[PDB]
């Protein structure tokens, strides 16, 4: 994973869990909790999951419930590095467009591997949003969709589908209702 994106989530564990349980679970992993992530740098999957599983054990927060809300507050922090993915869009644009950002924002990368997020309208007040990548992060993903909804204020309901592995991917889907249409032209 990308350092900063990373430094983010540090950043948020702070916020939610205060400086005390996160420096030590950064220690815990060979760290300085003092550590200076680079404008560069890319930080390893297996690194953060092990950040977390001491979040967890520290807090006694089950770690779906950390990533979750993580996703619920990252929205925030998007919007102040890329204010024009939410400048006059609503939440059904923005959540449209969501595929396509992974891929532009990711496709300068060696190796990259984004998230596929395809979105499509399955009634006129409602989409259907796959997660599909091999990070199997259900709840970051699910806590983002929260947080754009709580961001956009526009209330949605969302209901899981789908959840699984395969093709060595992992799979959610889910329906997401709008409370008045979107897609009657
Ligand atoms: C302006 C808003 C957003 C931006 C700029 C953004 C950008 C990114 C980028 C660059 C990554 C790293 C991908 C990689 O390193 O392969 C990422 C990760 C991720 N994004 Fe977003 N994202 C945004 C909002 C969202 C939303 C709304 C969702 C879901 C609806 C989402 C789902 C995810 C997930 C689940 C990951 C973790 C990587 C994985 O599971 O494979 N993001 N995002």
Redesign the pocket.
């Known amino acids: 994973?990308?350092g900063t994106?990373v430094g983010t989530w540090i950043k948020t564990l702070r916020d939610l869990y205060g400086n005390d349980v996160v420096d030590e679970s950064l220690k815990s992993v060979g760290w300085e909790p003092d550590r200076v992530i680079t404008p560069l740098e890319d930080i390893d999957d297996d690194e953060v999951r092990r950040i977390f599983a001491k979040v967890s054990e520290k807090t006694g927060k089950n770690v779906n419930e950390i990533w979750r809300e993580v996703?619920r507050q990252?929205?925030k922090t998007?919007?102040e590095?890329?204010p024009s993915?939410?400048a006059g869009r609503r939440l059904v644009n923005?959540?449209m467009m969501?595929d396509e950002?992974?891929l532009q924002?990711?496709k300068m990368?060696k190796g990259?591997?984004?998230?596929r997020?395809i979105a499509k309208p399955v009634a006129k007040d409602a989409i259907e949003?796959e997660?599909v990548?091999?990070?199997?992060?259900?709840d970051?993903?699910?806590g983002?969709?929260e947080?754009?909804s709580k961001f956009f204020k526009e209330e949605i309901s969302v209901e899981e589908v789908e959840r699984g592995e395969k093709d060595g991917f992992?799979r959610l889907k889910v329906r997401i209702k709008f409370k008045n249409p979107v897609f009657e032209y």
């Open positions: 994973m990308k994106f996703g990252n929205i998007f919007s590095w890329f993915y939410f923005f959540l969501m950002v992974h924002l990711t990368i990259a591997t984004p998230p997020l949003m997660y990548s091999k990070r199997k992060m259900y970051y993903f699910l983002l969709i947080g754009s992992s």
